[PDB]
RNA sequence: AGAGAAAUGGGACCAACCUCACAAACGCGUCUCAGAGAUAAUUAAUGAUUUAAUCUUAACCUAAUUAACUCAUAAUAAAUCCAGCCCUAGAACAGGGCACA
RNA sequence: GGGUUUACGACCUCGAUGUUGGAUCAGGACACCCAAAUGGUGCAACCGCUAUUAAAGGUUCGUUUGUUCAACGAUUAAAG
């Protein structure tokens, strides 16, 4: 959360985390959601829309970031670590935007 | 840099690293906390 | 056994040319056997007053190996005699300058400190690579074993040996290398 | 062979005639030394691998001498070559593409007006000279009490060392040694008499043999592009060069007596 | 083993994780009741910097070490194996465990000096110009003191400073 | 960053001035003076132990970097004629000339 | 930790190791005055103050005083 707050997330429009909380491989995605929906991430930019889609039979947790450069970062996280997803998202945001 | 015999962190942002065979207390916020173990 | 006097004397006090590979070998362990063969301490007929001394041809001197951090620590000090002419070169710099100098100085120091040292050093032949003249190659008799066993790298291991060696631990499937 | 960026040219062996003043178009006055190339011939050629392993060696001979005062080997060598004996014989490190056939003559037009050269020669030998003239040491006072010491070197070493160091400056021979002057500019080339006008002073007395070559300084390493690369062949052009080749700044003797504006 | 792959298809970035098959431990260990990998395969005080077939089991493809919480070694064996991997990398074993730099592999440099049992790093040790006298001699360290407990078949101790 | 000038020191030399009643020596006068590697302190790139970071007595290549010190490069570098006579060569011995005239 | 000052000791020399300052020539150490590469500053700039690395090269001319020192005049990149 601190690494995202020190990044200037002002250049992102929508972030949606679609997952099923009754699976066995949603821990990383749940922590990713809690890190990207922290208070500092909220206050650093208020124009962003953070959606948390909860399903029961999707069985494929994933995240989708549409940001105002017309860019779409889609990460279907089934085995990635939360730290790796955080670093990838941060590096991509700081690269484009 | 100050060459000393005993290094100690003077703030919470000082980090101790081993480089060129010596120990170094590096500080990014307060550059006057730069210490080098002789 | 039933030789004549002159051929028996010649056969007994004849000189022998030995070969020595120096690739991936310690200079001191090379110089030990080199100095032994140069002095003639390998002959039961040896004597300090006799001229018993064999030739030693060391090849692959450029590919020599130093143990530990000796390449950067061991220094060689010389003095040109003039004031301010005291030089101290690192072993690595001396090797980059003259490849034979390292093992040459090693054998020179390991040899005895009498006047015979120069004579038996004249019977020492050092070559940086496997480029020995034909005249010297036609004199060799045998090749001495390397004093240090060179270990194989990971790529030099056969697949049979790699599969024969057991996997001591099991990495988890969720880990990423 | 064509010229390459890493090529080296052969040199000459001339005779130091004397010195002359020479004025430039900006009013300055320099001093030039006249070197006359009397009889320069390439005597022998040693291959690169047989001489140095880096560059080949061309041997050049100087002015002609008498047959009756040379040894049998030198006379045999010159008889096999087909030339009369030379006085001074020098060796020049050249590249493999700038080699010339032994027995070819070389002329002063080898150098062109405006160029930098190196000049090697034995300096004027002053014999066994004292320490004050050999090393520029200061003497003791003249008359304030000093007894028989007005030109002595003084102390030569230290008491604890109990010896003197090999680099100790002491009286001895001074002058009869080979020295090289670097970066001498050429102003004028007299082609009729084969004379070169080099800038400044040249080591050695007059009427002595001087070994001239291209300047090996790093500032003039790629100047040989416009110069005649193998050598100056006067029969290749089939057109005689002017009597005097001057530089672009030399006040030629026939001049409008330049005045400022 | 898990691998992270990236797919770029028209300003759309897809990050995917793929799990591939990994080799497991051999079925019959000599000491099954041992808690530690080395100390249960009976390799304690047996390996060295030359045993690359053992040192290469747990390292990253770029020569880095593996975490102890993931491997399972006891702290002393982990430190020993770390120093042995360092010494092997410095001696020249494990040549395929380096990053591939196609831009940097072309500008060749001075040839690598052969070495072995190197304790310190070659870019940090200063040359001993004084070398000391007989009573105060500046000895040169060879090998690591962590390998002083290895089995000595000859009976003589290892000269760690020479 | 870019242009010049000078001083010191190393090595040399008399066209002119100056010392100068030998043809020379001499300064007070004139000419020339350099490329590559390498490092120590100190900066950053990649990256594990310590899936973050971290210049690394962690490996791989990395780059910006003092003076020294080495090396390009320069000088010498054609063996057995030497009585005598000259010499800008020299204490002696050595060394260069003795055909143009 | 060093062995520059004064002292302490009295070990080598009293059938001699000639004793301060200067003139000439200097060799070396670095605990660097200048020149070179940097770190920190209560470093805005010019000037500074400290610390690190580096000893190939330099480190002036005068009045007084026998002076080493010291005061003073004019400079130097500095007058270790
Ligand atoms: Mg004379
Ligand atoms: Mg005087
Ligand atoms: Mg008197
Ligand atoms: Mg008198
Ligand atoms: Mg008297
Ligand atoms: Mg003595
Ligand atoms: Mg001068
Ligand atoms: Mg990392
Ligand atoms: Mg950083
Ligand atoms: Mg050289
Ligand atoms: Mg003669
Ligand atoms: Mg004392
Ligand atoms: Mg006392
Ligand atoms: Mg006594
Ligand atoms: Mg007593
Ligand atoms: Mg006495
Ligand atoms: Mg007596
Ligand atoms: Mg001195
Ligand atoms: Mg210092
Ligand atoms: Mg300074
Ligand atoms: Mg000094
Ligand atoms: Zn701090
Ligand atoms: Zn264990």
Helices A27-36 and A82-95: angle between axes, nearest 10 degrees: 40
List the alpha helices (DSSP H) in chain C: 5-12, 27-39, 70-73, 91-97, 101-110, 116-122, 134-137, 159-164
| Burial of C3: CB neighbours in 10 Å, binned 0-12, 13-18, 19+ | exposed
Is E17's CB within 8 Å of A79's CB? yes
Q: Name, in order, each residue with C-beta under 8 angstroms of D259's C-beta and a sequence gap of 6 or more.
A: none
Strand F, nucleotides covered by protein (CB < 7 Å)? 10-16, 25-26, 29-35, 40-43, 46-63, 69-82, 88-91, 96-100
Query: Which letter does DSSP use for residue E73 in this model?
Result: -
- Do residues C61 and C103 touch, judged by C-beta distance below 8 A? yes
Which residues hold their Cβ within 5 A of ligand 2, which is an ion? D 139
| Tokens standing for residue D1 | 């062979």
Q: Residue E91 pairs with which residues in a beta bridge?
A: none
Q: Name, in order, each residue with C-beta under 8 angstroms of A50's C-beta and a sequence gap of 6 or more.
A: A14, A15, A16, A17, A36, A37, A42
| Tokens standing for residue E36 | 């530690």
Q: Quote the CA–CA distance of E92 and C83 in Å, as a whole number.
A: 42
Any contact of D with A, at least 3 CB pairs below 8 A?
no
Q: Quote the CA–CA distance of E62 and E23 in Å, as a whole number.
A: 19
E159 touches chain C (CB under 8 A): no
> How much distance in Å is there from the Cα of D225 to the middle of ligand 19?
49
Residue D110, marked binder? no
| Tokens standing for residue C117 | 């040292």
CB pairs under 8 A between B and E: 6
* Domain residue limits, chain C: 1-177
Cα D225 to chain centroid distance, Å, stands at 21
CA distance readout (Å), D224 to B1, B16, C129, D52, D120: 53, 59, 39, 22, 19
> Regarding the domain delimited by A1-97, which CATH topology (the fold level of the hierarchy) does it fall under?
Glutaredoxin (3.40.30)
Any contact of E with D, at least 3 CB pairs below 8 A?
no
Nearest C-alpha neighbor of D26 from the set D224, D242, D234, D251: D251
| Tokens standing for residue D78 | 């010159």
- Where residue C47 falls (left for φ over 0; alpha for ψ -120 to 50; beta otherwise) is beta
Cα C120 to chain centroid distance, Å, stands at 15
- Do residues A62 and A53 touch, judged by C-beta distance below 8 A? no
User: Distance (Å) from the C-alpha of residue E25 to the closest C-alpha of chain B?
Assistant: 36
| Burial of E123: CB neighbours in 10 Å, binned 0-12, 13-18, 19+ | exposed
Taking the CA atoms of residue B22, residue B27, residue B28 and residue B31 in that order, the dihedral angle to the nearest 10 degrees is -100
Go through chain E and tell me how many residues it has: 162
Strands C75-79, D12-23: pairing is unpaired
Query: Which letter does DSSP use for residue E146 in this model?
Result: G
In sequence order, what E strands does chain D have?
12-23, 29-36, 40-46, 56-61, 89-94, 105-106, 116-122, 128-129, 172-173, 178-190, 195-199, 209-214, 244-246
Q: Quote the CA–CA distance of C165 and E142 in Å, as a whole number.
A: 28
- Residue that has been written with the tokens 């090999």 in this structure: D166
CA distance readout (Å), E26 to A8, C88, E30, E47: 51, 54, 10, 18
- Where residue E132 falls (left for φ over 0; alpha for ψ -120 to 50; beta otherwise) is left
Closest CB from E12, E18, E19 relative to A74: E12
Q: Encode burial over B2-36: b for 16+ CB neighbours within 10 A, e otherwise.
A: eeeeebeeeeeebeeeeeeeeebbbbeeeeebebb
- Do residues D188 and D244 touch, judged by C-beta distance below 8 A? yes
Secondary structure of chain A in HEC code, one letter for each residue:
CHHHHCCCHHHCCEEEEEECCCCCCCHHHHHHHHHHCCHHHHHHCCCCEEEEEECCCCCCCEEEEEECCCEEEEECCCCCCHHHHHHHHHHHHHHCC
| Tokens standing for residue D248 | 């672009």
- CB atoms under 10 Å from CB of D27, counted, come to 9
Q: Encode burial over D47-74: b for 16+ CB neighbours within 10 A, e otherwise.
A: ebeeeeeeebbbbbbbbebeeeebeeee
- Do residues A62 and A11 touch, judged by C-beta distance below 8 A? no
Nucleotide nearest to D144 (CA to C1'): G23
Q: Residue E116 pairs with which residues in a beta bridge?
A: C67
Is E13's CB within 8 Å of A70's CB? no
| Tokens standing for residue D106 | 């070389």
Determination approach: cryo-EM
Q: Quote the CA–CA distance of D138 and D150 in Å, as a whole number.
A: 9
| Tokens standing for residue D208 | 């002595």
Nearest C-alpha neighbor of C177 from the set E89, E160, E23: E23
Strands D195-199, D29-36: pairing is antiparallel
Residue D150, marked binder? yes
| Tokens standing for residue A82 | 């939360």
| Domain C1-177: assigned CATH number | 3.90.1180.10
Q: Name, in order, each residue with C-beta under 8 angstroms of D50's C-beta and a sequence gap of 6 or more.
A: none
Strands E12-19, E114-116: pairing is unpaired
Handedness of CA E46, E47, E53, E56 (dihedral sign): positive
Radius of gyration of chain B (CA): 9
Residue of E nearest to B18 (CA): E124
Is C162's CB within 8 Å of E95's CB? no
| Tokens standing for residue E99 | 């990053």
| Chain D residues with a Cβ under 8 Å from any Cβ in chain C | 165-167
- CB atoms under 10 Å from CB of A66, counted, come to 16
Please report the resolution in angstroms.
3.0
State the DSSP H helix or E strand holding residue D78, giving kind and residue range, or none if neither: helix D72-81
* Domain residue limits, chain A: 1-97
State the DSSP H helix or E strand holding residue D131, giving kind and residue range, or none if neither: helix D131-135
- Residue that has been written with the tokens 């040249």 in this structure: D202
- Do residues D24 and D249 touch, judged by C-beta distance below 8 A? yes
User: Distance (Å) from the C-alpha of residue C170 to the closest C-alpha of chain A?
Assistant: 19
Please tell me whether any atom of strand F lies within 7 Å of the Cβ of D134. no
Q: Quote the CA–CA distance of E6 and C63 in Å, as a whole number.
A: 44
Residue of E nearest to A93 (CA): E13
| Tokens standing for residue D13 | 């062996």
Nearest C-alpha neighbor of E22 from the set A79, C160, C173: C173
**Could you give the count of Cα atoms lying within 13 Å of D252 in the half-sphere of its Cβ?**
12
Number of domains in chain E: 1
Strands B14-19, B2-4: pairing is unpaired
- Do residues D135 and D46 touch, judged by C-beta distance below 8 A? no
């Amino acid at each position: 959360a601190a690494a995202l707050a020190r990044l200037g997330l002002r250049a992102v429009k929508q972030v949606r985390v679609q997952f099923c909380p009754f699976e066995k491989n949603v821990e990383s995605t749940r922590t990713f959601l809690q890190a990207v929906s922290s208070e500092k991430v909220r206050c650093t930019n208020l124009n962003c829309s953070v959606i948390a889609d909860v399903r029961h039979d999707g069985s494929e947790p994933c995240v989708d970031v549409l940001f105002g450069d017309g860019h779409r970062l889609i990460m279907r996280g089934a085995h990635l670590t939360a730290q790796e997803m955080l670093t990838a998202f941060a590096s991509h945001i700081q690269a484009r935007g | 840099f100050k060459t000393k015999g005993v290094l100690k962190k003077r703030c919470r942002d000082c980090y101790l690293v081993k480089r060129r065979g010596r120990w170094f207390i590096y500080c990014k916020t307060n550059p006057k906390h730069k210490q080098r173990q002789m | 056994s039933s030789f004549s006097k002159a051929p028996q004397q010649w056969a007994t006090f004849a000189r022998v040319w030995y070969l020595l590979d120096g690739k991936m070998q310690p200079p001191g362990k090379l110089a030990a056997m080199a100095s032994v063969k140069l002095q003639g301490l390998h002959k039961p007929v040896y004597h300090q007053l006799s001229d018993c001394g064999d030739h030693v041809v060391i090849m692959n001197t450029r590919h020599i190996a130093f143990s530990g951090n000796k390449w950067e620590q061991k220094v060689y000090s010389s003095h040109t005699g003039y004031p301010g002419g005291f030089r101290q070169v690192t072993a690595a710099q001396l090797h980059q300058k003259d490849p034979v100098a390292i093992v040459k100085l090693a054998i020179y120091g390991m040899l005895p400190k009498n006047l015979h040292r120069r004579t038996m050093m004249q019977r020492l032949h050092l070559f940086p690579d496997e480029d020995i003249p034909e005249d010297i190659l036609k004199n060799l008799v045998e090749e001495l074993p390397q004093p240090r066993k060179v270990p194989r790298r990971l790529d030099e291991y056969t697949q049979e040996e790699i599969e024969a060696f057991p996997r001591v631990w099991s990495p988890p499937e969720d880990y990423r290398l | 062979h064509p010229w390459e960026p890493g090529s080296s040219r052969v040199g000459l062996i001339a005779l130091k005639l004397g010195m002359m003043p020479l004025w430039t178009k900006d009013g300055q006055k320099h001093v030039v030394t006249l070197l006359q190339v009397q009889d320069c011939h390439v005597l022998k050629y040693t291959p690169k691998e047989n001489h140095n392993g880096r560059m080949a060696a061309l041997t050049v001979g100087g002015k002609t001498v008498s047959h009756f005062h040379k040894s049998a080997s030198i006379l045999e060598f010159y008889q096999e070559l087909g030339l009369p004996p030379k006085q001074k014989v020098k060796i020049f490190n050249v590249t493999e593409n700038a080699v010339i056939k032994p027995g070819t003559p070389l002329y002063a037009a080898h150098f062109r007006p405006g160029q930098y050269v190196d000049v090697t020669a034995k300096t004027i030998g002053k014999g066994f000279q004292g320490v004050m003239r050999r090393w520029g040491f200061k003497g003791q006072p003249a008359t304030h009490g000093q007894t028989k010491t007005h030109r002595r070197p003084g102390a030569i070493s230290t008491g604890d060392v109990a010896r003197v160091w090999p680099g100790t400056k002491m009286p001895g021979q001074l002058g009869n040694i080979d020295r090289t002057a670097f970066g001498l500019k050429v102003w004028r080339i007299n082609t009729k008499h084969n004379i070169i006008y080099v800038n400044g002073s040249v080591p050695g007395h007059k009427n002595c043999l001087v070994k001239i070559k291209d300047s090996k300084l790093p500032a003039y390493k790629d100047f040989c592009k416009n110069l005649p690369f193998p050598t100056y062949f006067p029969d290749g052009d089939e057109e005689a060069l002017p009597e005097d080749l001057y530089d672009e700044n030399v006040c030629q003797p026939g001049a409008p007596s330049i005045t400022f504006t | 083993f898990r691998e992270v792959v990236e797919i770029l298809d028209g300003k759309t970035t897809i990050i995917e994780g793929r799990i591939t098959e990994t080799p497991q431990e051999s079925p019959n260990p000599p000491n099954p009741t041992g808690q530690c990998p080395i100390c249960r395969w009976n390799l304690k005080h047996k390996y060295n910097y030359e045993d690359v077939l053992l040192l290469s089991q747990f390292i990253r493809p770029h020569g880095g070490m593996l975490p102890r919480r993931i491997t399972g070694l006891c702290q002393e064996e982990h430190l020993k194996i770390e120093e042995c991997v360092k010494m092997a990398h410095r001696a020249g074993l494990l040549p395929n465990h380096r990053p591939k730099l196609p831009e940097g592999f072309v500008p060749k440099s001075k040839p690598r000096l052969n070495r072995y049992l190197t304790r310190w790093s070659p870019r940090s040790v200063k040359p001993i110009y004084n070398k000391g006298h007989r009573w105060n001699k500046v000895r040169m360290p060879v090998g690591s003191p962590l390998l002083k407990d290895n089995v000595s078949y000859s009976g003589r101790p290892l000269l760690l400073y020479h």
